[PDB]
UniProtKB/TrEMBL annotation, chains A, B:
The keyword Cell division does not apply. This is Transcriptional regulator, PadR-like family. Cu(2+) 2 binds at residues 11, 92. The lineage of its organism: Bacteria, Bacillati, Bacillota, Bacilli, Lactobacillales. One of its GO terms (molecular function) is metal ion binding. Cu(2+) 1 binds at residue 11.
């Protein structure tokens, strides 16, 4: 539902930034393109998410020379994704063992 | 941190149940075994999670003939995992496009 979607939108946004600092319009457009035109992120939703991410020091913003407002993944954001990737990888292995397909 | 761990524990618990109705001790033991002895789930933590899952109609419990208390994934729980699997699969494809490794 809404929760799973926010969790998914979080993951996508962090991955876009991990690839390069980016601005809102650009992020939305590239996510739509990379999803075969299926995932059309809502701008207000991104702001909700960014507000939480910047409070938690995961992302920061700055002006890029009108000027565009760029968002960037912080050093903490980078570290957190590395942790997430390793821990979720372990979860996948557990599931693989349990399913025994 | 705590949040990501709860999200991960949720995913593992649902997958264990998807494979078969199971009781707390059994779940903890099998998860530890399937994780190479690394993930030792805390019993109180499972109860916190189960309480939320049964309120949301994702899991239910019943007596198995002392009797063990079995937990089972509901029809809704099953449907939700199918939805989750398909949507997260799409998220992975987006990430694959973005990373272009």
């Amino acid at each position: 539902p809404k929760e799973m979607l926010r969790a998914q939108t979080n993951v996508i946004l962090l991955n876009v930034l991990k690839q390069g600092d980016n601005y809102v319009y650009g992020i939305i457009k590239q996510v739509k393109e990379a999803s075969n035109g299926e995932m059309e992120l809502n701008e207000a939703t991104l702001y909700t998410i960014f507000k939480r991410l910047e409070k938690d020091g995961i992302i920061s913003s700055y002006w890029g020379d009108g000027r565009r407002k760029y968002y960037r993944l912080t050093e903490i954001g980078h570290e957190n994704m590395r942790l997430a990737f390793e821990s979720w990888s372990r979860v996948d292995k557990i599931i693989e063992n349990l399913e025994a397909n």
